[PDB]
């Protein structure tokens, strides 16, 4: 009958690292190995009340009583130094391969059917579209999340690191490549073939991804945000805490992993909204919406359950989405 397995757990392929951010001046980007890092420091803010009022606190006297007592915070802020106009975000990406084999699975027959399914996928078409889109998201600095939006010129340098050194170096213009269009290119095709040789299981791939961004002298960079324990008074409240590894600001690795997964152009809504990150029930949390709802038959779970159990292979875009979900990893399976 071949029911689905109780547990399933796919390892995260495309492992990134915690993206360290240092700073320096442009036109000396080639000597950017001894650049000093962007340190997270603190400053205090004083805010007025600004949010909406729920029809009871709309009294004028109570409003002026609220604006007579402002809140005090101590936020973490991270800025470039005053004599540097380039942010250098450095992380390494490791492509593993063996995307079809799960780590944990109960049903042996489901394991064989799933391995056979992924084998027919990779035999009919290799990791060519998926690696092209992953190389695109490496090329345009989308992992620079909000450090990209005001940038004058973004340059991404990708080094394939062999035994102790670089074997093949790339260089890109991340503003020439749009954030919503997957075109074809000369260097991007070689990068997609390298990531294809990684994902297929035919070699060891370790890329070092370095991204420079002209932001300006002493502007604000945006490392990832830690949550606070909420233990103290509301004057030293410590409202915002920024991530840092060792006296150096950093983006979380799962944020880089979410940024590289924005390849899903094949969701049933309008494509003018751009590609989204590959997730089951493909949902952007910024826009609060869940494309590929289970009412439509285009989420990950019904597509996989039709492809594996009853052999209903979808179109090539939906199975591109499914293999991108298997590359993404996760815990799948019911109770």
């Amino acid at each position: 009958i071949l029911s689905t397995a109780s547990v399933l757990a796919f390892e995260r392929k495309l492992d990134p690292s915690d993206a360290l951010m240092s700073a320096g001046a442009w036109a000396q980007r080639d000597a950017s190995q001894e650049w000093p890092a962007v340190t997270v420091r603190e400053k205090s803010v004083r805010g007025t009340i600004s949010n909406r009022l729920k029809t009871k606190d709309r009294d004028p006297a109570k409003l002026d009583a609220s604006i007579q007592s402002p809140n005090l915070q101590t936020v973490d802020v991270a800025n470039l130094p005053s004599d540097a106009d380039t942010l250098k975000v450095r992380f390494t990406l490791r492509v593993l391969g063996g995307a079809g084999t799960p780590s944990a699975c109960n049903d042996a027959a489901y394991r064989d059917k799933l391995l056979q399914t992924v084998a027919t996928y990779v035999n009919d078409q290799g990791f060519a579209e998926l690696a092209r889109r992953y190389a695109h998201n490496l090329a345009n600095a989308r992992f620079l999340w909000r450090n990209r939006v005001g940038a004058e010129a973004v340059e991404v340098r990708i080094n394939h690191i062999r035994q102790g050194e670089v074997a093949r170096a790339w260089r890109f213009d991340a503003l020439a490549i749009g954030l919503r269009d997957f075109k074809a290119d000369a260097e991007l095709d070689a990068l997609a073939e390298l990531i294809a040789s990684g994902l297929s299981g035919s070699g060891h791939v370790l890329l070092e991804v370095v991204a420079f961004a002209r932001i300006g002298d002493g502007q604000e960079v945006f490392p990832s945000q830690e949550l606070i324990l909420d233990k103290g008074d509301k004057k030293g409240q410590k409202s915002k805490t920024l991530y840092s590894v060792r006296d150096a600001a950093a983006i979380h690795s799962q944020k880089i992993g979410n940024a590289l997964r924005t390849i899903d152009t094949w969701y049933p809504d309008e494509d003018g909204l751009g590609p989204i990150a590959v997730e089951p029930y493909g949902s952007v949390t910024s826009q609060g919406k869940a494309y590929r709802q289970p009412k439509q038959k285009l989420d990950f779970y019904t597509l996989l359950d039709n492809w594996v159990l009853r052999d209903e292979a979808p179109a090539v875009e939906q199975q591109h989405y499914v293999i991108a979900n298997l590359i993404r990893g996760g815990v799948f399976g019911e109770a």
């Binding site: 007592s69 103290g232 008074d233």
Partner: protein
Amino acid sequence: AQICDEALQYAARLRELEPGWSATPGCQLHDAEQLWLDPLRAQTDETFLQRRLRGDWPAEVGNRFANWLNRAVSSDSQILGSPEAAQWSQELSKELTMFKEILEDERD
């Protein structure tokens, strides 16, 4: 109602029983409370914290107490999806308004 009455009586005997709210300082006492230390900050410090309590009117403790009450409801999706969540939030807001307005007139 009985919950907020016992909370208010607990505050009353804790604030008027001993000087233990003003016994030893530190870094963590949740000192945004200022309700369990009513005569503890005014009877000795007449200018330092007394203006910090009369002008502030420290009454934001009801929100943290409300968040303490929201653990008492069972965090189930079925009781969240039905109108029982709206009815429950309605009665908590009513008795929280009562707790707020009684906490408010502490300076007189």
